[PDB]
Nucleic acid binder design. Structure first.
Lengths: 91, 112, 135, 252, 77
RNA sequence: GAUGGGGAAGCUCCGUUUCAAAGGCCUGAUUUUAUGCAGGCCACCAUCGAAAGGGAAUCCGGUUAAGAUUCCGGAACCUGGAUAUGGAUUCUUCACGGUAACGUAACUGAAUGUGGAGACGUCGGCGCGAGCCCUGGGAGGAGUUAUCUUUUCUUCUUAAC
RNA sequence: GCUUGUGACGGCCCGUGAAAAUCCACAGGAAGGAAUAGUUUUCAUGCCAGGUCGUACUGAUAACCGCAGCAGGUCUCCAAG
RNA sequence: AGAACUGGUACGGACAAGGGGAAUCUGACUGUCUAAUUAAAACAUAGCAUUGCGAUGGUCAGAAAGUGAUGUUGACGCAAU
């Protein structure tokens, strides 16, 4: 049963704070509190603790990432830039 | 129901002022001060609590015999079994690969 | 095929002798009524001989080259098999099923192993086995 | 008149930083012979949250080569690093995110962070969350290198100054609206006494130059010259253009 | 202090050259679901501890009370 | 907030580990060495600052006109020090058992390094424990009793270690 | 059932929510040691000492502050049917 | 939760305990201040925009200093609006 129609998590703020501000807040809190896969153990056990620290409940492997996402889109190509830039040193 | 009072001179309830009321033999309710609770010793590598070691306040550890302060393993009262177990694996295998690194180096440079 | 032979050298990761190498005297792949698993009879050593130098002399050499062995049943899951091999052609009938329990007769097993390993430690024989593992 | 809220922040009485829960400075490892001639193996033990900083820290341990002991170092955790990762420092370090290298040792196109203004201050530039500086050309003559700062300014620095590869974690933090007053209060309770802000027009003439008047108006010109005097530098300081700037981004 | 339940060792600590006094206590207690019996306690005061030996049968009391050395000052009851 | 320092005519101001060569410390020498001396050494780097922040160790009974976790009695534990008695250890000279998590009262050990405790946000529900509340049987006392009530109240307790 | 303590948890954050004294443990191997007995005083027992300062009472519409024994103010633990 | 009966139709029987609706002006809301006449459409708040600054720096303090606050900071930051 879909209890709430369109505001979901941000509906806890009642009617205050406008509609777009709640909606824009709504978008980030969905992935801020979401469950991510771990690169070291491959489980749905990655959660955010503190600002920009992503820890894995199993195997205690903590991965540094974005303030609200494990891997922010603005920096996913940064390692792609480096990795593409590494091979020119060798070949 | 009888009501109790503080026996020390501090009138506020804190972690250092915990109070447990006990049934005194004289037939009255007396407040009995409880010391702060001990915390389990933790492994240095995995952070989890390590079993087999007595838990007590820090200074009072100087009185307990070594049977509650040292298991018969290597890294007795500092690491916990599994951390020691893989510490052996990491030490044994890397030294095993190090000589493998050395033998290949002696062969490639010789045939260079 | 089966590389857990009767001369194999391994490392112990569980029990009191954690991090001390051993030599497999007799393997039991099919198990037994007691220890119903892949237990192994090892004769490794507990106290490693300290390093000796040219400055050391006479009594200060003999005491340093002292080895305290031990005999113990260990499961395969607590051992680290290697390709190394140690010469065990001395003590076939020393370590066996009757060697354990009634520990009074366990003593001579720990004595013949010490003297046999004492001889094998002199000169550059099995240098890796008698070197203390850093971990 | 009276001393102003902008003037009162110089004495540092109640405006000191709330440096109780801050683990320590995030300065880079001090340069030494092992660094400018080779690379050092090193590992981070844990990554910790700093107070008043949106970027996670990193506690990297470097074995002292001179003496038998361990040295812990506080590094700004570049996004993509994890506990137990081998962070490499020196000339011969490879090109991977997390390692720190001098700018002269890296080819064109690389973006780095926590770079040194001078060779040995252990990192001054691009330390905030999500910031980076791009390598936009080398100057082998007279050993310089020029880079693009996160504000778009182009600065030329020495090729010997060190910088750590990769962007800094915690980026995209300001994309979340701050919503409540208390969230601002919680954020600023650990940084400094700079909140809340009271408008100078509302107060009296003693409290601020904008003060006074039967209406809520600034009065004379708000923009203040750079060559002004402390005590009246409480408006637009040496403004070049005001109003909505027009045009696209990525200006020359 | 603690309580010890061995007869042979108990005599050893009586003449242990540090015990000066000792006391004996009698209690009339119950047992099981039957008639009560005669119960006695033997107490020994050491230098830092107070040992004791409880006996629920007066049969063993006779041969023990005579075994106490005369030099030990006993507070009867 | 005092030194080393830098200002200030100056009362004094800045900083307090920063442009200071800033310290004691275990082994050995012993047998005029008292403690010097010959080496291994480590370098922290004034002091103050929270009787509700951290903190080594005890309770019960009783006793004054006024005191008590302080006094009387009984029963504990901690620290500093000196010396033995008993036990374990050993010609496998510095222990054994269990496959293992680990255990057995004891069951060598320095410089140095590492690790843990101290050390710890708030809210919500759940489990368990203690104190109190409710209540049955029984052993006593007190209350009512014109009529009724196997009735009402009350004692039945146990400490640190 | 109320008070309280504790345990495994879950929610919150661009707040993730103290330091040191002190105590212990591990790696390391210096140094010394056997049975005619040497250690063992972080095993059981035995011997001695624990210095200085405070301890009475109120803590409130009469003991504190408000010229007064002034309906004002002053922090906290226990709390039954 | 339900069914019969019963009470001069009384039954949250004492205490306890929301008046409600159509609108208009204005501040978005929670919050804060003239402690001793103004609690407010005033201040504050999130949001929006602008400005200065790449530290041999931007803003501010000091009588100097081998002095400081931001700064245990770095443009997703600090400072002024």
């Amino acid at each position: 049963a879909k209890r709430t129609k369109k505001v979901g998590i941000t509906g806890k703020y009642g009617v205050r704070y406008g509609s777009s501000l709640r909606r824009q807040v709504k978008k980030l809190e969905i992935q801020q509190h979401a469950r991510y896969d771990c690169s070291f153990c491959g489980k749905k056990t990655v959660k955010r603790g503190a600002a920009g620290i992503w820890t894995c409940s199993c195997c205690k492997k903590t991965v540094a990432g974005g303030a609200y996402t494990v891997s922010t889109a603005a920096a996913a190509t940064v390692r792609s830039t480096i990795r593409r830039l590494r091979e020119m040193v060798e070949a | 129901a009888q009501r109790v009072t503080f026996r020390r001179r501090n009138p506020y309830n804190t972690r250092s002022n915990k109070i447990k009321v006990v049934k005194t033999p004289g037939g009255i309710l007396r407040a009995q001060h409880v010391k702060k609770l001990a915390t389990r010793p933790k492994c240095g590598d995995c952070g989890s609590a390590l079993q087999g070691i007595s838990t007590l306040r820090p200074r009072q550890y100087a009185t307990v015999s070594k049977t509650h302060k040292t298991v018969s393993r290597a890294y007795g009262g500092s690491r916990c079994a599994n951390c020691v177990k893989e510490r052996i694996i990491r030490a044994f295998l890397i030294e095993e690969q190090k000589i493998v690194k050395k033998v290949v180096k002696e062969q490639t440079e010789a045939a260079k | 095929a089966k590389f857990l032979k009767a001369g194999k050298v391994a490392v112990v990761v569980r029990g009191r002798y954690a991090g001390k190498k051993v030599v497999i005297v007799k393997p039991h792949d099919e198990g037994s009524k007691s220890h119903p698993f892949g237990h192994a009879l090892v004769a490794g050593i507990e106290r490693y001989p300290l390093k000796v130098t040219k400055k050391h002399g006479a009594k200060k050499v003999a005491k340093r080259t002292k080895i305290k062995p031990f005999i113990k049943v260990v499961n395969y899951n607590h051992l680290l098999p290697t390709r190394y091999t140690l010469d065990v052609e001395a003590f076939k009938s020393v370590v066996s099923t009757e060697t354990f329990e009634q520990p009074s007769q366990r003593e001579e097993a720990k004595k013949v192993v010490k003297k046999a390993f004492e001889e094998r430690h002199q000169a550059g024989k099995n240098q890796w086995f008698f070197s203390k593992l850093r971990f | 008149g009276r001393v102003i809220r902008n003037q009162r922040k110089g004495a540092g009485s109640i405006f000191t930083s709330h440096t109780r829960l801050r683990q320590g400075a995030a300065k880079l490892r001090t340069l030494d012979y092992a660094e400018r001639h080779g690379y050092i193996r090193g590992i981070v033990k844990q990554i910790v949250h700093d107070s008043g900083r949106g970027a996670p820290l990193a506690k990297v341990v470097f074995r002292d080569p001179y003496k038998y002991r361990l040295r812990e170092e506080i590094f700004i955790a570049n996004e993509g690093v994890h506990t137990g990762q081998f962070i490499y420092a020196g000339k011969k370090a490879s090109l991977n995110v997390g390692n720190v290298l001098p700018l002269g040792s890296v080819p064109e196109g690389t973006i780095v962070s926590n770079v040194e203004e001078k060779p040995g201050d252990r990192g001054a530039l691009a330390r905030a969350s999500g910031n980076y500086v791009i390598i936009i050309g080398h100057n082998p003559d007279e050993n310089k290198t020029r880079v693009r700062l996160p504000s778009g300014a182009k600065k030329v620095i020495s090729s010997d100054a060190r910088g750590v590869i990769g962007v800094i974690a915690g980026g995209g933090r300001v994309d979340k609206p701050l919503l409540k007053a208390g969230r601002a209060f919680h954020k600023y309770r650990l940084k400094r006494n700079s909140w809340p802000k009271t408008r100078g027009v509302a107060m009296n003439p003693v409290d601020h130059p904008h003060g006074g008047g039967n209406h809520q108006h600034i009065g004379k010109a708000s923009t203040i010259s750079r060559g002004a005097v402390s005590g009246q530098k409480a408006g637009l300081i040496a403004a070049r253009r005001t109003g909505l700037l027009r045009g696209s981004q990525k200006t020359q | 202090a603690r309580e010890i339940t061995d007869i042979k060792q108990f005599l050893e600590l009586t003449r242990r050259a540090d015990v000066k006094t000792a006391t004996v206590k009698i209690n009339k207690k119950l047992n099981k679901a039957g008639k009560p019996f005669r119960q006695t306690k033997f107490k020994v005061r050491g230098s830092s501890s107070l040992y004791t030996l409880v006996i629920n049968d007066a049969g063993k009391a006779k041969k023990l009370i005579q075994s106490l050395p005369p030099t030990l000052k006993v507070n009867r009851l």
